Homo-oligomer: A and B are copies of this chain.
Amino acid sequence: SSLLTEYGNDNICRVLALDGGGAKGFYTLGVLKEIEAMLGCPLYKRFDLVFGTSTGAIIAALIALGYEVDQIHALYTEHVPRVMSSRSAAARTMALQDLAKEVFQDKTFEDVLMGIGIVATRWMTERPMIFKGNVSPGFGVSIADAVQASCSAYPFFERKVIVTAAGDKVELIDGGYCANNPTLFAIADATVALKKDHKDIRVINVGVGIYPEPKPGLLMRIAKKWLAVQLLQKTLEINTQSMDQLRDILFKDIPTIRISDTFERPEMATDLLEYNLDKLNTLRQRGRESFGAREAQLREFLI
């Protein structure tokens, strides 16, 4: 490929954290494409660790398997909007199962080229379950099952049942309920497991952007339970932003860049419902612009 630039090793732990957000990760991919092109290497050759939640876990997993961002974009375009276009629990659940199997096949957490964390929510304990790999990885679960769990947005998708290698059966739902912004769990991994000093950590947290809130009049035309749909989206946004604020309070001294800017267009449905590829494709340009507003600091962070 064209990404032939090589970087020497140092004692700096470079961490990438990708928010969930329905099919709006086209924004995320626009940011990531510019970071990749800036660096001249696949992202796994520069970052030590990537965390992702829900559809951000799709991107994180492909990064950790060594994909280039244009390849991720092709896979994302051909599978993620179809999931969000579903309008029944059966259709949503089967569409997501098909995505997971088709995109990740039988890759496991022993197949990754960098550190990875994928966040889901445990139904019974209401606490996170984080699938990890490096170099029992992922609790013995396939990447497809872990990403599927990370994306299982009950009550609109079915809960995802997995059995760990130790034989424990757990029901899981979308990780956005506990960590749609996974950055604090990534920082915990860098500080508590990888035993890195705060000064030696660099965190890039890429969101999906912020767009005009859909109003009840619009949601009522595309969803019979529009209030639940609106509540899901607003609580997801609050958890995403408040997690960022909690990070800034507790870890002032961990160098961090968060890229998730606010735009007045496109007008979209919620993350659960939006699948219009015309609107979603415009988010790539918005992500590129968000990179451009931070390129000098991103250069000094990476490189």
Contacts and interface: CB of A to CB of B under 8 A. Distances in A.
A178 B242 contact: yes
Contacts of A242: 121, 126-128, 177-179
Contacts of A126: 237-238, 240-242
A275 to B, nearest CB: 21
Interface in A233-292: 234-235, 237-242, 244-246, 249-250, 252
A225 interface: yes
Contacts of A239: 177-178, 239
Nearest to A119: B242
A222 interface: no
A232 B229 CA distance: 11
Contact of A238 (B178, B227, B231, B250): B178
A228 interface: yes
A55 interface: no
A155 B188 CA distance: 34
Contacts of A2: none
Top 7 A-B residue pairs of the complex, sorted by shortest distance between their CB atoms: A178-B242, A126-B241, A228-B228, A227-B228, A127-B245, A126-B238, A177-B238
Given A127-B238, A155-B227, A188-B249, 16 more contacts: A121-B238, A121-B242, A126-B241, A126-B242, A127-B242, A177-B239, A178-B239, A184-B246, A185-B246, A185-B249, A188-B250, A192-B249, A192-B252, A227-B228, A231-B231, A250-B250
Interface of A: 121, 125-128, 155, 177-179, 184-185, 188, 192, 225, 227-228, 230-232, 234-235, 237-242, 244-246, 249-250, 252
29 contacts: A121-B238, A121-B242, A125-B241, A126-B237, A126-B240, A126-B241, A126-B242, A127-B241, A127-B242, A127-B245, A128-B245, A155-B230, A177-B234, A177-B238, A177-B239, A177-B242, A178-B238, A178-B239, A178-B245, A179-B242, A184-B246, A185-B246, A188-B246, A192-B249, A192-B252, A225-B225, A227-B228, A228-B228, A228-B231
